Design a protein around this ligand. Structure first.
Ligand SMILES: [Cl-]
Ligand SMILES: [Cl-]
Ligand SMILES: [Cl-]
Ligand SMILES: [Cl-]
Ligand SMILES: [Cl-]
Length: 317
């Protein structure tokens, strides 16, 4: 069931016209309407799903609320950032084909995901790379958290490079993102019966393991586990992913004793102190507490000093 005729022109709900190209779920290259065919260097994609697909509705709502082009540029200029790794929303609508109803959404097109680059690099990323990636992820999490959402599923496969700049990383996939703070009121410490997702097992938060709705501390903890994975090739619990009980137990005990996480993950002494410090600060957060994002970035910046570097934006990939 091909939802589009290749090269057709579709009009979104604001009457913006787009042309549909080849497939890169169901995701087609896309560009502005013109007499030219959509090419392999197209700047957008169009995602299309049945109109009763829950995840695309959720993601679309996130993008409409938090990823308006002007909204992101405004933030970038005011916070004095080089860029912001939240993808831009370009439009959406309803498409009916073959007696079926579909929803589509136009968004930025990206280059490679980090997971492929990570594997091509024998499952290792330098300390330089990890610190530079993570500073930019903290800009992204600060942004989405300030617009009432948590991601709950940060990982290398959800991190894409700017197609035209290998130093800019973007966080994608908001189909199971969660609105933790609707209208400024924080969700209570409790399960959300509308939410079925626990994140990705190896990286997810102790909160999600405990069956409660994800909050901001959860996102920062997920990034902690990513940083260790990226630096070492491994997480302590990776041999028991099939049992969630085991994964949660190891996570809980290692939070209680961060020095033994450092000893386990970086054998023969020598753990990078900024990672331990980062974890210690995240440990301090209550469920509903606003993180001190700039302090977290500072910690990471001390790491860059230690290695003879600076925040020069170079991902080194
Ligand atoms: Cl805003
Ligand atoms: Cl994750
Ligand atoms: Cl929450
Ligand atoms: Cl929190
Ligand atoms: Cl290995």
């Amino acid at each position: 069931a091909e939802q589009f005729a290749v090269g057709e022109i579709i009009t979104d709900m604001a009457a913006a016209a787009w042309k549909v190209g080849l497939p890169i779920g169901c995701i087609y290259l896309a560009d502005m309407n013109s007499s030219e065919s959509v090419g392999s260097d197209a700047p957008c994609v169009v995602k299309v799903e049945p109109s009763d697909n829950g995840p695309l509705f959720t993601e679309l709502k996130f993008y409409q609320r938090a990823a308006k082009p002007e909204q992101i540029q405004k933030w970038i200029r005011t916070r004095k950032l080089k860029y912001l790794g939240v993808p831009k929303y370009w439009g959406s609508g309803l498409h009916d084909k073959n007696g079926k109803s579909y929803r589509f959404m136009i968004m930025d097109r990206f280059g490679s995901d980090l997971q492929k680059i990570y594997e091509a690099n024998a499952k290792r990323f330098s300390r330089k790379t990890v610190l530079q990636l993570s500073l930019r992820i903290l800009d992204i999490l600060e942004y989405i958290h300030e617009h009432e959402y948590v991601h709950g599923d940060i990982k290398a496969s959800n991190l894409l490079l700017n197609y035209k700049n290998p130093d800019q990383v973007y966080l994608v996939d908001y189909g199971l993102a969660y609105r933790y703070c609707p209208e400024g009121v924080h969700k209570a410490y409790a399960a959300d019966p509308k939410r079925c997702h626990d994140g990705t097992i190896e990286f997810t938060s102790i909160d999600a393991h405990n069956g409660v709705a994800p909050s901001r501390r959860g996102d920062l903890e997920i990034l902690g586990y990513c940083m260790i994975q990226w630096l070492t090739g491994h997480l302590p619990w990776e041999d028991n992913l099939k049992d969630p009980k085991y994964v949660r137990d190891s996570k809980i005990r290692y939070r209680e004793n961060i020095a033994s996480l450092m000893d386990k993950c970086f054998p023969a002494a020598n753990a990078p102190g900024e990672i331990a410090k980062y974890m210690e600060t995240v440990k301090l957060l209550d469920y509903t507490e606003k993180p001190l994002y700039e302090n977290l970035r500072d910690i990471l910046l001390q790491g860059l000093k230690a290695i003879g570097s600076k925040d020069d934006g170079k991902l080194d990939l």
